[PDB]
Amino acid sequence: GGIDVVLVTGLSGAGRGTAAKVLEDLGWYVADNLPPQLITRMVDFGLAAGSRITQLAVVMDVRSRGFTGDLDSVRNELATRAITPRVVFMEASDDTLVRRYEQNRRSHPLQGEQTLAEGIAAERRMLAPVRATADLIIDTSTLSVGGLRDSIERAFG
Amino acid sequence: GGIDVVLVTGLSGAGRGTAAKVLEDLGWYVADNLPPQLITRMVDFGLAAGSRITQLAVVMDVRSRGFTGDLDSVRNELATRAITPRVVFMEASDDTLVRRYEQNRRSHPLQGEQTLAEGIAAERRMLAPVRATADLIIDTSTLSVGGLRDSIERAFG
Numbered sequence: 137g138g139i140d141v142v143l144v145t146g147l148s149g150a151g152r153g154t155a156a157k158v159l160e161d162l163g164w165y166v167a168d169n170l171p172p173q174l175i176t177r178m179v180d181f182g183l184a185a186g187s188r189i190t191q192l193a194v195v196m197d198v199r200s201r202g203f204t205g206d207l208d209s210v211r212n213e214l215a216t217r218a219i220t221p222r223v224v225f226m227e228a229s230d231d232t233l234v235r236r237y238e239q240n241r242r243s244h245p246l247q248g249e250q251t252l253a254e255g256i257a258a259e260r261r262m263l264a265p266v267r268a269t270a271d272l273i274i275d276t277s278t279l280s281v282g283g284l285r286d287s288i289e290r291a292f293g
Numbered sequence: 294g295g296i297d298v299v300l301v302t303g304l305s306g307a308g309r310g311t312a313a314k315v316l317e318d319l320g321w322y323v324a325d326n327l328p329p330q331l332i333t334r335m336v337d338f339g340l341a342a343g344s345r346i347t348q349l350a351v352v353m354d355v356r357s358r359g360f361t362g363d364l365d366s367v368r369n370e371l372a373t374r375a376i377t378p379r380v381v382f383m384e385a386s387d388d389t390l391v392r393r394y395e396q397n398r399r400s401h402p403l404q405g406e407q408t409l410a411e412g413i414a415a416e417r418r419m420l421a422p423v424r425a426t427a428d429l430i431i432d433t434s435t436l437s438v439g440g441l442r443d444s445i446e447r448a449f450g
């Protein structure tokens with residue numbers, strides 16, 4: 137209960153990692169791609185003296201082992217410790233996501249048996265219910281990195 | 294062991310996160326900024342069926358809670374599970390690191406109220422011992438992102 141927990145999630149390529157880095161610039165301890173089942177371990181570590189963390193941000197998304205799209209089990213276990221996480225959900229238009237993948241030349245996490253476009257759509261379907269529980273949805277369709285820096289500063293300042 | 298473990302460390306700005314993304318693109322499960330004490334929890338998680346992970350990469354650096362510069366405890370604990378981690382150490386020339394900090398407009402993790410160059414020199418001093426224990430040292434002074442993909446692919450593909 138003595139640690140602010142932020143969960144950063146959302147569409148791949150919408151800026152999860154960039155948003156994580158902004159939080160780091162603001163003084164948050166950021167852990168990326170922690171499996172849901174291990175968040176209680178991380179929170180207990182943060183509460184122990186000597187290794188104390190007062191502001192913890194975890195990036196959890198389609199890559200995270202055992203993440204299915206619902207944070208209910210995560211929210212349940214965190215509540216037994218008097219913690220209510222703030223969930224930030226990154227998204228962007230299909231057109232912006234496609235452009236970012238063409239520019240980086242990375243594979244989409246759900247691409248392989250389907251196209252890049254089909255992977256984006258499958259991720260949108262997977263995450264629509266958790267999106268509706270996010271405390272903050274940030275749409276990066278036309279945001280620069282500096283614009284994301286300002287949006288996050290405004291919400292975590 | 295039952296899981297291959299790679300620890301990615303090195304100088305801030307030398308490409309730790311970019312190297313981690315290449316491993317992710319090659320099929321590795323990548324967790325960034327895990328406290329050293331939680332390495333055993335992640336390995337145990339990856340060894341259980343239902344949450345199996347055969348190739349695990351962890352980024353651990355000056356940001357990681359409890360990381361002092363040595364990987365002695367980590368190597369000791371991993372040994373209790375018959376795992377020998379491979380350590381990858383990212384570095385670059387001072388000039389390249391400074392240019393990357395100017396271009397990305399972020400602060401160095403060890404800068405404090407000191408200058409950028411003071412932060413870089415402090416980190417080089419902290420990490421020189423663990424650098425000597427690295428299985429692979431990657432110098433990114435003149436590497437593009439494409440060059441680093443090729444380098445990592447040759448060492449891990």
Ligand SMILES: CC(=O)N[C@H]1[C@@H](OP(=O)(O)OP(=O)(O)OC[C@H]2O[C@@H](n3ccc(=O)[nH]c3=O)[C@H](O)[C@@H]2O)O[C@H](CO)[C@@H](O)[C@@H]1O
Binds near residue numbers: 154155279280283314
């Ligand atoms: C397109 C892409 O790289 N997707 C990957 C990226 O997603 P992730 O969602 O983490 O995307 P990043 O934070 O890397 O941002 C991707 C790109 O968008 C830019 N950007 C971001 C936010 C913003 O407001 N404005 C802006 O211009 C960034 O500068 C970068 O060029 O890393 C994940 C973790 O390895 C991978 O699973 C994703 O497949």
Ligand SMILES: CC(=O)N[C@H]1[C@@H](OP(=O)(O)OP(=O)(O)OC[C@H]2O[C@@H](n3ccc(=O)[nH]c3=O)[C@H](O)[C@@H]2O)O[C@H](CO)[C@@H](O)[C@@H]1O
Binds near residue numbers: 309310400437
């Ligand atoms: C300069 C910078 O941003 N440093 C931060 C970066 O370090 P980290 O060491 O993770 O650096 P990144 O992987 O973000 O790479 C830094 C920059 O160098 C480029 N690059 C990288 C490797 C390569 O071979 N060639 C190349 O040109 C990347 O495209 C990027 O522009 O993220 C860490 C985690 O938040 C922070 O602690 C560091 O302060």
